[PDB]
Amino acid sequence: GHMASGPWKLTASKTHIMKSADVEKLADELHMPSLPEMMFGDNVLRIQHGSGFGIEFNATDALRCVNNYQGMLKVACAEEWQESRTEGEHSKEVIKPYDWTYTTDYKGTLLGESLKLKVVPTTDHIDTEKLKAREQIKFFEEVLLFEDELHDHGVSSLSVKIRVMPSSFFLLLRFFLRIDGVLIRMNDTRLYHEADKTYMLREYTSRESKISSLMHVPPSLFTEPNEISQYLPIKEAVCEKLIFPE
Amino acid sequence: LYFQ
Ligand SMILES: [Cl-]
Ligand code: NI
Structure with a gap:
């Protein structure tokens, strides 16, 4: 729902999937034959600073990045x-x-009436030593954005979740795609921020592999994104800084 | 819950 900590306001909306009438309308707008079976168009995970700037993750903006018809x-x-x-x-x-x-390859929607985060390149990476560090998780939330079962040929899903620590937070937007007997694809957007810093780190990775190259792996892992990820080659990797406005 |  709503979670507050100083100038940061976290918002999470979880509701029912989009109705047929609104699905066909939106699909026409995006020049797509249809939307995912389970389209949570009113769902969101939103991080907002008191200044007005921030970033959110929703299904509609995610679908805009998809190759249309x-x-x-x-x-x-x-x-x-x-x-x-x-x-x-x-x-x-x-x-x-x-x-x-x-x-x-959606990486989130930037918020702000006037003030806005500036996306700049960086040589920095999200330090996993900081990620592995175990402070108490003050706030945790996971939001589903869309899911489709590919006419019973596998699964396509987009979800986002966040860890809030006393002096940092870590967010993961994950697109997961499995076509049974064919391939597994995973697009991860990781978002990290330390309390003192005047910027966020956003690291994007796109992994994929044919299932034929995963036959040495226990088949049960094919339905477990966290476990199968390490077996997938990285084909695209980008890290950017999201600079706070003045 | 400490996902990486
Ligand atoms: Cl086409
Ligand atoms: Ni913080």
Whole structure:
């Protein structure tokens, strides 16, 4: 719900999934055939400073990062689940087919009417020695953003959770994708802040592996993101500083 | 709960 500590205000909304009428409408806006079966459009995890600036994590902004419908599946598929109004577009990026997997490289939504966090590159990494350090967790919360079962072929889910310590907090946004017998993909966004500092660290990693390369691993781990992660090669890794405004 |  609401958690306060000085100038920081933490907000967590957990409600029912989006209704059909609002799903089709939003899907049309984002130029997608549909949304994940379980679309928690009213859910959020929000971190906000008294100054106004902050960062939040919601399902809608996450879906904006997903490759939308290009009209290529008409060639790739004998029959489609649903059609879609093809997206206007295009960027200078190579056109790739929609894949119904809802893969997203979303890293959170920056908040602020005027004052706002500035995203800058950094050579810093989130120090795991600080993460492994065990102070008492003052506040903990986990929020589900969306989930889909890929027409019973696996799972695609986006969730976010946060640890609040006496003088720091640590957040993990995780996109997890498993296509049964095919592949496992995991996009993690880690957010760290120390009380004294005037910045946050945000470390993004994208991992993925074909299941054929994971056959030495106990199959039970395929349904456990925390355990399977170490077996997945990192294909993209970015670390940025989120500088506090003056 | 001390996730990494
Ligand atoms: Cl397409
Ligand atoms: Ni703090």
